[PDB]
């Protein structure tokens, strides 16, 4: 809305090319630690 | 059809061990991994294919051309 | 004739009436040249557009 | 072996003329395959 | 779009324009056209291409954006608790462009 | 910092090398050498035929990563690749069969070969010292001796399970004279190339070129080579007794060690543990022990495919990189 | 001597040493990840990164930026020739201790 | 049916994104996931009330040099050979019918049935192929039949 697209999208290309190369280099993932609650929420849930 | 020559990850020679493995399973009643434990696979990636890969090729040889 | 009543008799007026044909499935919908078809897969390193 | 083709059940080698016979000799069986050549072939393992 | 050429075989595009196609990747298809006459090119490229068409007509929002990873991928770099190094920042700013 | 990596139950800490006089008030750890040299060391674990393991110290991740990488890809190894065949009738899909032999390792050295040229076509391509061509044939024969029903179908059928042993090699002019005391051998002779039954035969001569790992694993000198980062454990407070006995019970047998009910839990040795970070779940053991590793100190090992002594492999992969630089040094620079 | 190796990127630099972007042909993280390290410790340097434009293609781009004085390509010279010396050490001690075994 | 695979869950190589998987070379190179596709082609040789069958002959072989590359590839019989790389544009089976076969015959003839319109079926395709089996056989109605597979 300010500078017109030509440099605008030029940002977004930089967005992708950054993220796609970095994230995997750093890393991230799910875990069963995540989905299974540790003690706690099972008991309070039971009253819930 | 055949023991793959190497596992899809390690790329240690697998083929040698399939024969001797099955030997150690038939004679010498013994536990699977424990066999492979002293059979020389200490890392599971390789190990699966010994635990896996049903051997078809003989079940094919039933249909061999000469019978 | 044969007297089996196959069904397959109309299709001149019906030619330009419904579905795929002259109505609006072939003429308004014309099949096209200079084209290709595939499946998809990413390239973030490929620029937008 | 070296010759043209094989039975299905008999696995018996046989050669044939043209517009000749579909049956083999020994088999009361019909279908037959075609033997593989002696001609060299090539693959690349990769 | 403009056309670039690469190996293997398949249509490959940049992700931020997925949602316009509502492309799921996954196993789905597309189709590929080229104009013939020149004026058609200049038409669709400088009008009906991306950079001019970037906003949806309905609500007047940009429909294209980061989607999935790129979103969260920013967040991790974006995250406050993070920090970096002149070497780190270096190779990053490289990887960005 | 201080070559410490955070090992925390959900996360890690202090990863990137972060030593160079870019990032500090005082600007130090600036290059030179001989502080590098005299500080840099190395050690060996043990040396085997088809395997090597050893230890490295006091360098960043990068160059080590290089050695691993070039070691798994950019190093040379030679193998049979192109496949020519003397018919075949057998069950196995003949392509897949070729893929097999293509992959099977060989025990043979480089340095007795050269590289194929994409140019210089036709028969001029594969020539003499640049090629090792293998032939094999078996027509399975029924063993007329029939001891039982369904033995192993060896007593039934001669040479049913075909092995790398069953491969032989045809030497040629100047090809013979050189490998006389280097008999051509297919690494581990025991592999199942094919199974079959009499009324079947397979014959071939495939070809053998030098190759590079990144292009195909079949050119790997190595089954797998990797560097496990050397583990470390810092511990606090006496915390002795069965609770401490439970503590070591939280780890693989190498673990720490127990002198007595007193003298708490002392580290027996490192590098035995899997760095498997269990203690942080039991939540009591937490405050006395932090987990981490030293970025300077690399557990680094390798499997030889049987190609050659890995100590000399590793030594090579180094020089291959040294070359790769050197060639770039005195290479000019166009604008 | 082969003149397709490193084709300097003109658009990269302004003038006079300073910064430059490079494409090394047929090469990858093995080097680049190494080389960036050996470079970054050279005091006058600012910013030395690298990346691949696309994995599907093989070209390697290493970026370099510095303070005044010493030139980029001069820095790349120095650091690279230093990486030579690193290898020299690796062999020097490695083969030694293993010669002793 | 399938592969027992070693899998990680991560964002590596930001090509990942939506549902897109990513593989290891020199794994698929070591072999993995490798496929074969057995397809088939069938040809019914049908005789004609002209009392004239259809002929499978072929393999012209100019120059004495070689069977023409447009064709080649078959064998002395003039039919596709077991286990040969066979490529688009070429013929693995040659079927030919007479031109007078299409019309109304009479029992008045002298010599030439020899006119044969030939429609050898090309194997089209985007890549190389092999022929590991071919079959010369007959159905109930006593007419030659060839059903082959690539
Ligand atoms: Zn494995
Ligand atoms: Zn028969």
Curated annotation (Swiss-Prot), chain A:
Instruction: Tell me which domain of life the UniProt entry assigns to the organism this sequence originates from.
Output: Eukaryota
As for subcellular location, the record says: Nucleus
Transmembrane feature ranges: none
Family, similarity comment: Belongs to the RNA polymerase beta' chain family.
Q: How does it assemble?
A: Component of the RNA polymerase III (Pol III) complex consisting of 17 subunits.
What job does the chain carry out? DNA-dependent RNA polymerase catalyzes the transcription of DNA into RNA using the four ribonucleoside triphosphates as substrates. Largest and catalytic core component of RNA polymerase III which synthesizes small RNAs, such as 5S rRNA and tRNAs. Forms the polymerase active center together with the second largest subunit. A single-stranded DNA template strand of the promoter is positioned within the central active site cleft of Pol III.
| Protein name stated in the entry | DNA-directed RNA polymerase III subunit RPC1
Curated annotation (Swiss-Prot), chain B:
One GO term under biological process is: transcription elongation by RNA polymerase II
Q: Which GO terms describe its cellular component?
A: nucleoplasm; nucleus; RNA polymerase I complex; RNA polymerase II, core complex; RNA polymerase III complex
The keyword Transcription appears for this protein? yes
Care to name a GO molecular-function term for this sequence?
A: zinc ion binding
- SUPFAM superfamilies to which the protein is assigned, alphabetical: RNA polymerase subunit RPB10
Cellular compartment(s): Nucleus, Nucleolus
Cite the entry's keywords alphabetically.
Answer: DNA-directed RNA polymerase, Isopeptide bond, Metal-binding, Nucleus, Ribosome biogenesis, Transcription, Ubl conjugation, Zinc
Cross-link type Glycyl lysine isopeptide (Lys-Gly) (interchain with G-Cter in ubiquitin), placed at 59
Q: Does the keyword Nucleus apply?
A: yes
Instruction: Assign the protein's first listed, main location to one coarse class.
Output: nucleus
- Cited Pfam families: RNA_pol_N (PF01194)
- The protein's assembly and partners: Component of the RNA polymerase I (Pol I), RNA polymerase II (Pol II) and RNA polymerase III (Pol III) complexes. Component of the RNA polymerase I (Pol I) complex consisting of 14 subunits: RPA135, RPA190, RPC40, RPA14, RPB5, RPO26, RPA43, RPB8, RPA12, RPB10, RPC19, RPC10, RPA49 and RPA34. The complex is composed of a horseshoe-shaped core containing ten subunits (RPA135, RPA190, RPB5, RPO26, RPB8, RPB10, RPC10, RPA12, RPC19 and RPC40) where RPA135 and RPA190 form the DNA-binding cleft.
- Additional note from the record: Present with 5300 molecules/cell in log phase SD medium.
Protein family membership: Belongs to the archaeal Rpo10/eukaryotic RPB10 RNA polymerase subunit family.
Protein name as annotated:
DNA-directed RNA polymerases I, II, and III subunit RPABC5
Recorded source organism is Saccharomyces cerevisiae (strain ATCC 204508 / S288c) (Baker's yeast)
State the organism's lineage: Eukaryota, Fungi, Dikarya, Ascomycota, Saccharomycotina
The gene it comes from is RPB10
UniProtKB/Swiss-Prot annotation, chain C:
Instruction: Output the superkingdom of the source species.
Output: Eukaryota
Q: Where is this chain's protein located in or outside the cell?
A: Nucleus
Additional observations: Present with 6020 molecules/cell in log phase SD medium.
Protein's job = DNA-dependent RNA polymerase catalyzes the transcription of DNA into RNA using the four ribonucleoside triphosphates as substrates. Largest and catalytic core component of RNA polymerase III which synthesizes small RNAs, such as 5S rRNA and tRNAs. Forms the polymerase active center together with the second largest subunit. A single-stranded DNA template strand of the promoter is positioned within the central active site cleft of Pol III.
Self-association state and partner proteins as the record states: Component of the RNA polymerase III (Pol III) complex consisting of 17 subunits.
Give the protein family.
Belongs to the RNA polymerase beta' chain family.
Q: What is this protein called?
A: DNA-directed RNA polymerase III subunit RPC1
Q: Organism, per UniProt?
A: Saccharomyces cerevisiae (strain ATCC 204508 / S288c) (Baker's yeast)
> What high-level taxonomic lineage is stated for the organism?
Eukaryota, Fungi, Dikarya, Ascomycota, Saccharomycotina
Gene of this entry: RPO31
Swiss-Prot record, chain D:
Keyword match Cell membrane: no
Task: Locate the residues binding Zn(2+).
Answer: 7, 10, 24, 27
What happens to this protein after translation, modification-wise? The N-terminus is blocked.
Instruction: Give start-end positions of each zinc finger (C4-type).
Output: 7-27
The UniProt keyword set, sorted, is: DNA-directed RNA polymerase, Metal-binding, Nucleus, Peroxisome, Ribosome biogenesis, Transcription, Zinc, Zinc-finger
Keyword Secreted on this protein? no
Q: Name one GO biological process term.
A: nucleolar large rRNA transcription by RNA polymerase I
Query: Record's GO cellular component, any one?
Result: cytoplasm
Where does this one sit in the cell? Nucleus, Nucleolus; Peroxisome
* GO MF term list: DNA binding; DNA-directed RNA polymerase activity; zinc ion binding
Similarity comment text for this entry: Belongs to the archaeal Rpo12/eukaryotic RPC10 RNA polymerase subunit family.
Chain's role: DNA-dependent RNA polymerases catalyze the transcription of DNA into RNA using the four ribonucleoside triphosphates as substrates. Common component of RNA polymerases I, II and III which synthesize ribosomal RNA precursors, mRNA precursors and many functional non-coding RNAs, and a small RNAs, such as 5S rRNA and tRNAs, respectively. RNA polymerases are composed of mobile elements that move relative to each other. In Pol II, the core element with the central large cleft comprises RPB3, RBP10, RPB11, RPB12 and regions of RPB1 and RPB2 forming the active center.
Additional detail: Present with 907 molecules/cell in log phase SD medium.
Q: What is this protein called?
A: DNA-directed RNA polymerases I, II, and III subunit RPABC4
- Source organism (scientific name): Saccharomyces cerevisiae (strain ATCC 204508 / S288c)
């Amino acid at each position: 809305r300010d500078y017109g697209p030509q440099e605008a999208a030029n940002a977004m290309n930089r967005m992708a090319k950054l993220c796609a190369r970095f994230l995997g280099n750093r890393g991230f993932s799910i875990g069963i630690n995540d989905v299974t609650p540790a003690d706690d929420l099972k008991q309070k849930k039971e009253e819930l | 059809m055949i023991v793959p020559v190497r596992c899809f990850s390690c790329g240690k020679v697998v083929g040698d061990k399939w024969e001797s493995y099955l030997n150690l399973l038939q004679e010498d009643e013994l536990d699977e991994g424990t066999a492979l434990s002293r059979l020389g696979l200490k890392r599971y990636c390789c190990r699966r294919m010994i635990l896996t890969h049903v051997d078809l090729i003989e079940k094919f040889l039933r249909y061999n051309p000469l019978e | 004739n044969g007297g089996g009543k196959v069904k397959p008799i109309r299709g001149f007026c019906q030619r330009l009436k419904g579905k795929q044909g002259r109505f609006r499935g072939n003429l308004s919908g014309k099949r096209v040249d200079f084209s290709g078809r595939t499946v998809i897969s990413p390239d973030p390193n490929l620029s937008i557009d | 072996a070296t010759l043209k083709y094989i039975c299905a059940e008999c696995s018996s080698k046989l050669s044939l003329s043209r517009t000749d016979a579909v049956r083999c000799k020994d088999c009361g069986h019909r279908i037959l395959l075609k033997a593989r050549t002696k001609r060299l072939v090539q693959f690349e393992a990769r | 779009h403009y056309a670039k050429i690469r190996p293997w075989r398949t249509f490959r595009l940049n992700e931020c324009v997925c949602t316009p196609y509502n492309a799921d990747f996954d196993g789905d298809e597309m189709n590929l056209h080229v104009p013939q006459t020149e004026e058609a090119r200049a038409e669709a490229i400088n009008l009906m291409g991306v950079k001019n068409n970037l906003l949806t007509p309905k609500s007047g929002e940009p429909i294209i954006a980061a989607t999935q990873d790129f979103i969260t991928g920013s967040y991790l770099i974006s995250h406050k608790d993070s920090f970096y190094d002149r070497a780190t920042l270096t190779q990053l700013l490289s990887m960005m462009s | 910092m201080s070559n410490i990596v955070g090992i925390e139950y959900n996360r890690v800490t202090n990863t990137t090398s972060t030593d160079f006089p870019g990032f500090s008030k005082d600007a130090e750890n600036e290059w030179n050498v001989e502080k590098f040299k005299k500080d840099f060391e190395v050690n060996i674990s043990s040396l085997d035929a088809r395997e090597a393991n050893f230890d490295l110290i006091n360098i960043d991740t990068s160059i080590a990563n290089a050695f691993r990488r070039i070691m798994i890809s950019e190093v040379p190894s030679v193998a049979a690749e192109y496949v020519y065949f003397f018919n075949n009738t057998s069950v196995i899909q003949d392509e897949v069969l070729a893929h097999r032999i293509g992959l099977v390792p060989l025990k043979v050295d480089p340095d007795m070969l050269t590289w194929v040229d994409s140019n210089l076509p036709d028969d001029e391509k594969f020539t003499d010292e640049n090629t090792i061509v293998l032939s094999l044939n078996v027509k399975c024969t029924r063993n007329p001796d029939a001891p039982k029903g369904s033995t192993d179908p060896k007593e039934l059928y001669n040479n049913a399970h075909v092995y790398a042993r069953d491969l032989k090699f045809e030497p040629q002019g100047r090809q013979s004279t050189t490998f006389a005391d280097c008999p051509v051998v297919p690494a581990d002779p025991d592999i199942l190339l094919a199974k079959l039954r009499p009324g079947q035969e397979i014959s071939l001569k495939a070809h053998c070129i030098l190759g590079i790992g990144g292009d195909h694993a079949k050119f790997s000198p190595v089954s797998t080579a990797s560097y496990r980062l050397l583990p470390q454990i810092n511990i606090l407070q006496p915390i002795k007794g069965e609770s401490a006995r439970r503590f070591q019970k939280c780890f693989p047998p190498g673990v720490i060690g127990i002198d007595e009910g007193s003298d708490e839990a002392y580290v027996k040795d490192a590098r035995k543990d899997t760095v498997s970070r269990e203690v942080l779940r039991y939540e009591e053991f937490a405050d006395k022990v932090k987990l981490g590793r030293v970025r300077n100190h690399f557990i680094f090992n390798v499997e030889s495919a049987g190609a050659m002594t890995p100590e000399e492999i590793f030594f090579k992969s180094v020089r291959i990189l040294k070359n790769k630089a050197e060639y770039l040094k005195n290479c000019p620079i166009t604008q | 001597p082969d003149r397709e190796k490193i084709k300097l990127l003109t658009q990269a630099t302004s003038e006079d040493g300073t910064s430059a972007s490079f494409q090394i042909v047929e090469e990858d993280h093995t080097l680049g990840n190494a080389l960036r390290y050996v470079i970054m410790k050279n005091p006058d340097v600012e910013f030395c990164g690298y990346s691949i434009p696309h994995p599907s293609e093989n070209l390697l781009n290493i970026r370099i930026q510095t303070y005044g004085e010493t030139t980029a390509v001069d820095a790349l010279q120095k650091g690279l020739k230093d990486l030579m010396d690193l290898c020299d050490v690796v062999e020097s001690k490695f083969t030694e201790k293993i010669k002793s075994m | 049916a399938g592969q027992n695979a070693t899998v990680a869950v991560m964002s590596y190589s930001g090509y990942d994104i939506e549902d897109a998987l990513v593989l290891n070379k020199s794994s698929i190179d070591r072999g993995f996931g490798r496929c074969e596709t057995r397809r088939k082609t069938t040809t019914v040789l049908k005789r004609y009330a002209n009392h004239t069958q259809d002929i499978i002959g072929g393999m012209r072989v100019d120059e004495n040099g070689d069977p023409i590359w447009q064709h080649q590839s078959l064998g002395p019989d003039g039919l596709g050979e077991v286990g040969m790389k066979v490529q688009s544009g070429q013929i693995y089976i040659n079927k030919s019918v007479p031109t007078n076969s299409a019309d109304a015959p009479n029992p008045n003839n002298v010599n030439v049935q020899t006119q044969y319109r030939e429609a050898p079926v090309i194997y089209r395709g985007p890549e190389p192929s092999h022929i590991d089996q071919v079959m010369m056989s007959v159905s109930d109605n006593d007419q030659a039949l060839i059903k082959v597979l690539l």
